[PDB]
Design an enzyme around this catalytic site. Structure first.
Site, PDB file in Angstrom:
ATOM      1  N   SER A 145       0.854  -1.181   0.000  1.00  0.00           N
ATOM      2  CA  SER A 145       0.000   0.000   0.000  1.00  0.00           C
ATOM      3  C   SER A 145       0.896   1.238   0.000  1.00  0.00           C
ATOM      4  O   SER A 145       2.040   1.181   0.467  1.00  0.00           O
ATOM      5  CB  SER A 145      -0.875   0.067   1.277  1.00  0.00           C
ATOM      6  OG  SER A 145      -1.728   1.222   1.271  1.00  0.00           O
ATOM      7  N   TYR A 158      -3.386  -1.003   9.689  1.00  0.00           N
ATOM      8  CA  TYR A 158      -3.132  -1.465   8.318  1.00  0.00           C
ATOM      9  C   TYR A 158      -1.719  -1.055   7.881  1.00  0.00           C
ATOM     10  O   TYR A 158      -0.975  -1.853   7.288  1.00  0.00           O
ATOM     11  CB  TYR A 158      -4.202  -0.811   7.435  1.00  0.00           C
ATOM     12  CG  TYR A 158      -4.126  -1.061   5.972  1.00  0.00           C
ATOM     13  CD1 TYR A 158      -3.609  -0.081   5.102  1.00  0.00           C
ATOM     14  CD2 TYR A 158      -4.603  -2.236   5.444  1.00  0.00           C
ATOM     15  CE1 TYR A 158      -3.601  -0.282   3.735  1.00  0.00           C
ATOM     16  CE2 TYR A 158      -4.570  -2.482   4.077  1.00  0.00           C
ATOM     17  CZ  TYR A 158      -4.087  -1.480   3.240  1.00  0.00           C
ATOM     18  OH  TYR A 158      -4.079  -1.736   1.902  1.00  0.00           O
ATOM     19  N   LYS A 162       1.469  -3.131   6.441  1.00  0.00           N
ATOM     20  CA  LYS A 162       1.969  -2.845   5.113  1.00  0.00           C
ATOM     21  C   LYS A 162       3.416  -2.361   5.093  1.00  0.00           C
ATOM     22  O   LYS A 162       4.128  -2.650   4.140  1.00  0.00           O
ATOM     23  CB  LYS A 162       1.023  -1.881   4.365  1.00  0.00           C
ATOM     24  CG  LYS A 162      -0.383  -2.472   4.116  1.00  0.00           C
ATOM     25  CD  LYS A 162      -0.330  -3.751   3.295  1.00  0.00           C
ATOM     26  CE  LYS A 162      -1.737  -4.067   2.733  1.00  0.00           C
ATOM     27  NZ  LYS A 162      -1.722  -5.037   1.610  1.00  0.00           N
TER      28      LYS A 162
END
Lengths: 265, 256
Positions: A145, A158, A162
């Site tokens: 990401s 998240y 990532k």
């Protein structure tokens, strides 16, 4: 051993039944690759596979949850059986999930680290030794990401996962280059959808979502091109560039700030 | 409020029995902080607390295996009880494993991820709500590594965990700035400690120099703590590799 083309090559795509996984697998197949797709959902995987066969391609589906190493090992075994070898592994799982760090409970953390970090580590554990033993090079790609490259408020959890995937990809690239295995990491953009006047007419902080301004088909074309060019980073949105620059400038200036206060090392 | 000085403040340090953690705890105490040191090596922890107390510092030891959220919660509860409150949390405990990624077994991955990444996450889970409730700001510092900022062949698994720590620190800094809680992430290259021997058993710049820089960075509220200037060029090289991707894509005809 670096991938010279997709035609007649064998590719495994995890999370291949939808989203980035399916778009990328479809692009590989358009270029002549034979496919093994995995996903958690047997009937939805069967549908994606049948769609690809309907377009004239050669595809198989294997049920696998990337959070479970044993299932990933089973997937690697099945992929080598069905394809007779594996040239490209595209590790992909999960979607953008947001929320303030202060409000993440332990289950939130566990889920995200499992799907978004362990799912990628497991792809290396299950496939890397087999690709090295096969001894013909190939390519390993990951979906990380933009949130793996810079901090984004509201994507703390998240983002942690990532960042780990980006670190994995960058080190792996260096280690297996001598074996003719290329490595790439796809870093899709995120956006905080600001409240529009129409929605405003009709407390958790910013809640970014995936950027949808560039089609999945266009990103899949860039991804396949990047793999063939053996580029380590795949950065579909130009807006990312300045945020990355700002992060590295903040790190860099720290050295001068330390020296100004008397640090000598 | 961001930390104004250490005198009379309360600090908790994980991995405090040895190395950078012990040195930093000692530096905080020299500057007048009251300390809770935490570690898994129980005799070492007791010895380290004795060393601080012998210097007239107010220090306590609380055992905590940072792999276990319940233990970190117990640590936070006991630190608030012992000190009255907590102003600075230094999430420092860690281990190293080395070798090519292809050589790592699943246990290597689990040990490193559980201590080096989950220890940090657990420190936030346990301390952040208590700091917000206390409502007087504070500071949260993490020990990551130079390997949290750039790739290093042979330190892949360690690097995955340390990248996660850097990402945690960078996002947390933005989210809790309005609450007056500062955040720092310490990213050294090699420092002579007991890291290697302790890592195997569990399964230049001195530590005291690092401790002075770390205490100073906390008071200045700097996000990054970078003791080794040799790291600078490698970080720049990584940025350049990322940045040039945009031009390489555009040259291929990518317009987005």
């Amino acid at each position: 051993g670096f991938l010279s083309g997709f035609d007649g090559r064998a590719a495994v795509v995890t999370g291949g039944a939808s989203g980035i996984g399916l778009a990328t697998a479809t692009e590989f197949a358009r270029r002549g690759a034979r496919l093994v797709l995995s996903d958690v959902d047997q009937p939805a995987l069967e549908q994606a596979v049948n769609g690809l066969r309907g377009q004239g391609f050669d595809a198989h589906g294997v049920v696998c949850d990337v959070r479970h190493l044993d299932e990933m090992v089973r997937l690697a075994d099945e992929a080598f059986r069905l394809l007779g070898g594996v040239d490209v592994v595209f590790s992909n799982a999960g979607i953008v999930v947001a929320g303030p760090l202060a409000q993440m409970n332990h289950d939130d953390w566990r889920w995200v680290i499992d799907i978004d970090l362990w799912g990628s580590i497991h792809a290396v554990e299950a496939f890397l030794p087999r690709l090295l033993e096969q001894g013909t090079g190939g390519h390993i790609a990951f979906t990380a990401s933009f949130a793996g490259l810079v901090p984004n408020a509201g994507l703390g959890t998240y983002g942690v996962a990532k960042y780990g995937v980006v670190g994995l990809a960058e080190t792996l690239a260096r280690e297996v280059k001598p074996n003719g295995i290329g490595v790439s990491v796809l870093c899709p953009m995120v956006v905080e959808t600001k409240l529009v006047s129409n929605s405003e007419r009709i407390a958790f902080g910013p809640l970014p979502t995936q950027d949808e301004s560039v089609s999945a088909d266009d990103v899949a074309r860039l991804t396949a091109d990047a793999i063939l060019a053996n580029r380590l980073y795949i950065l579909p949105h130009a807006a990312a560039r300045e945020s990355i620059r700002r992060r590295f400038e903040r790190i860099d200036r720290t050295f001068d700030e330390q020296a100004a206060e008397g640090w000598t090392h």
